[PDB]
C-alpha cells in the first residue's frame, strides 16, 4: 500500500504512552508504546521514553507513505508534548495537533482517593 495522509493518535496516560498511526480510514498502521521499547517496570513514564516511543511510530510508518499527519492527543501524562516534537523530527509536516481528552458531563463516579 501507499497512503499519503493519516491521523495519528497518542494515548498519554500516567503509566504509559501509546502512539498509533492510522489513516483517515482509522485503521491502525504502526503502534509503538513507551514500554514496548524495552522499559518494563518503574522508571520512565517520562517525556524521555515517549520521545523514544514516538519515533518508532515514525520510522515504521515510513513504509506506506504518510507525509502529512494529524495528531490526536488523549491523556494527562508526561510524554504529551514530547511525542509531537518527536514526530515532526521523523520527517512529518503535521498539520495541527488536536486534543481529544474524554471528559464526562457528569458520568460514572471515580475510584476512592488513594491514601
Amino acid at each position: 500500500k501507499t497512503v499519503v495522509d493519516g491521523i495519528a493518535h497518542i494515548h498519554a496516560s500516567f503509566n504509559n504512552t501509546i502512539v498509533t498511526i492510522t489513516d483517515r480510514q482509522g485503521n491502525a498502521l504502526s503502534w509503538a508504546t513507551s514500554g514496548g521499547s524495552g522499559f518494563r517496570g518503574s522508571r520512565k513514564s517520562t517525556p524521555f521514553a515517549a520521545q523514544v516511543a514516538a519515533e518508532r511510530a515514525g520510522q515504521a510508518a515510513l513504509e506506506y507513505g504518510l507525509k502529512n499527519l494529524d495528531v490526536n492527543v488523549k491523556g494527562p501524562g508526561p510524554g504529551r508534548e514530547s511525542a509531537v516534537r518527536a514526530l515532526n523530527a521523523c520527517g512529518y509536516k503535521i498539520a495541527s495537533i488536536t486534543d481529544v481528552t474524554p471528559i464526562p458531563h457528569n458520568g460514572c463516579r471515580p475510584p476512592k482517593k488513594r491514601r
Partner: protein, 154 residues
C-alpha cells in the same frame, strides 16, 4: 552563598615557556625535594619527543582533542529521584580531565625510569587509542536517560 574564589594560573617558564604545563610542578615534586624531582619534572618533556619525531607539545597539545567529555554529572533532586544535569560546559570544566586523567593513570604500567612513567601516555594524545580516550566517549554514552534532564525537574 556567593563565590569569592578567584582563579589565576601563572603561565610562563625559563625552560619550556608553555601554557598548562609550565606551573605544573606540584604532582611531579612528589612531597620531598626538587633536586631529585628536577630531572623527573622536566626530564620527561624531552623524553616523549625523544622516542618519536614531532616535538613534545605536538602530541601534548592534542590531549584536549579526544579526552574531554561533552557533559556533566552533578546530582540534584526535586521530589522524586535524583537527576543530574549534562550540557556543554566551559572549556576549563571540560578540559580538566584531558590531561590529569591521562597523566595519573600511568602507575598501572610503570616501565623503566620514573620520568618515562610520567611520560608513558603523553604521546598517546593524538590517536587516542589508550585509556584516557576510552572514558572520554564513555561519558557521552551515559546520558540517554539523562538527555532530558536540564529544564523540567532539573
Amino acid at each position: 552563598r556567593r563565590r569569592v574564589a578567584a582563579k589565576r594560573e601563572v603561565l610562563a617558564d625559563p625552560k619550556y615557556g608553555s601554557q598548562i604545563l609550565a606551573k605544573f610542578m606540584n604532582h611531579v615534586m612528589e612531597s620531598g625535594k626538587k633536586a631529585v624531582a628536577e630531572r623527573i619534572v622536566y626530564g620527561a618533556l624531552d623524553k616523549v619527543k625523544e622516542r618519536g619525531k614531532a616535538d613534545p607539545l605536538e602530541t601534548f597539545e592534542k590531549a584536549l582533542d579526544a579526552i574531554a567529555p561533552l557533559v556533566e554529572v552533578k546530582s540534584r533532586r526535586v521530589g522524586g529521584a535524583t537527576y543530574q544535569v549534562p550540557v556543554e560546559v566551559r572549556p576549563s570544566r571540560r578540559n580538566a580531565l584531558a590531561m590529569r586523567w591521562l597523566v595519573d593513570f600511568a602507575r598501572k604500567r610503570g616501565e623503566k625510569s620514573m620520568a618515562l612513567r610520567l611520560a608513558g601516555e603523553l604521546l598517546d594524545a593524538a590517536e587516542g587509542k589508550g585509556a584516557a580516550v576510552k572514558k572520554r566517549e564513555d561519558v557521552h554514552r551515559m546520558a540517554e536517560a539523562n538527555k532530558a534532564f536540564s529544564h523540567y525537574r532539573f
